[PDB]
Amino acid sequence: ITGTSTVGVGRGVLGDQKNINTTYSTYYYLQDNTRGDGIFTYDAKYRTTLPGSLWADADNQFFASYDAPAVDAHYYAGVTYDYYKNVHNRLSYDGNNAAIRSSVHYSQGYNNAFWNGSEMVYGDGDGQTFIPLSGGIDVVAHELTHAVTDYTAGLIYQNESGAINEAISDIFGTLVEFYANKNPDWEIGEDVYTPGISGDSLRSMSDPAKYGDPDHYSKRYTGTQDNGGVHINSGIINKAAYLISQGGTHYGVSVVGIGRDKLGKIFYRALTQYLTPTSNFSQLRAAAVQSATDLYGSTSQEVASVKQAFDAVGVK
Ligand SMILES: [Ca+2]
Ligand SMILES: [Ca+2]
Ligand SMILES: [Ca+2]
Ligand SMILES: [Ca+2]
Ligand SMILES: [Zn+2]
């Protein structure tokens, strides 16, 4: 829409108050003209037709319970855009400031959220397994990172390349959660998963086996479910990334941590310069080693830690 840029206020899924960028033109719309070609949030009104209607509001105050998922989709897309711009110098997901569009209230009782190739889509959850999925900043950033991967490495969504694709989304989702300093951790989806149980999450990067995902290449899933295990075998790479950052000893192999910032620079470089659509785990190891070599030198501690981490999860 064409109108005047302004700032409104509302409450997210978790009850927290936040300011959001809006546009005025008769109604106030969830349209943020301050970032790239804009961030636009739509109401799918419990249907599956997309994108739905651009979110319009009469007084620029978004404190209704139907408003919550839209406030957080809109706000967390802006935080993810800022992370990629300020930390990695990347303008939006295509690198040229493409508009980011999200629809909320998709379908009824839908326990998922996803990047469909053109925009973000968020279910409200059934209220037991999940509450509206845009209340999780790591979920939002995980899904928007699929758009980055689509425009760069183009990892296909199956077998080892799909598991790399998911892991990359969990890694950067976690780094955005630390960047926003929103009670950060190495777990995925803990703010929106099972409102009645405390302490759990969908996946864990620091200990993937806590939920039964593999934490070593010898335990990888080899069947056909989940497109060949893209959500299951991502635990092997998530554990490697957690060790590079934080360090630790895993299956007897010791890794000195180099921290989150360097983790993010090595993986962003590997993703945007060396991975291809059919890269497998072994090629991800080579790409991460070459990236760390590019950035810090072949005899750095950073290269050594990347190697130990992949050796700790059995990826040669
Ligand atoms: Ca209102
Ligand atoms: Ca957290
Ligand atoms: Ca998290
Ligand atoms: Ca829970
Ligand atoms: Zn994903």
Swiss-Prot record:
Its cofactor is Ca(2+); Zn(2+). Its main location: secreted. The keyword Plastid does not apply. One of its GO terms (molecular function) is metalloendopeptidase activity. GO terms for cellular component: extracellular region. It comes from the Bacteria. Ca(2+) 4 binds at residues 193-194, 197, 200. Ca(2+) 3 binds at residues 177, 183, 185, 190. Its EC number is 3.4.24.27. Extracellular zinc metalloprotease. Belongs to the peptidase M4 family. This is Thermolysin. It comes from Bacillus thermoproteolyticus. The gene is npr. The chain holds residues 233 to 548 of 548 of the full protein.
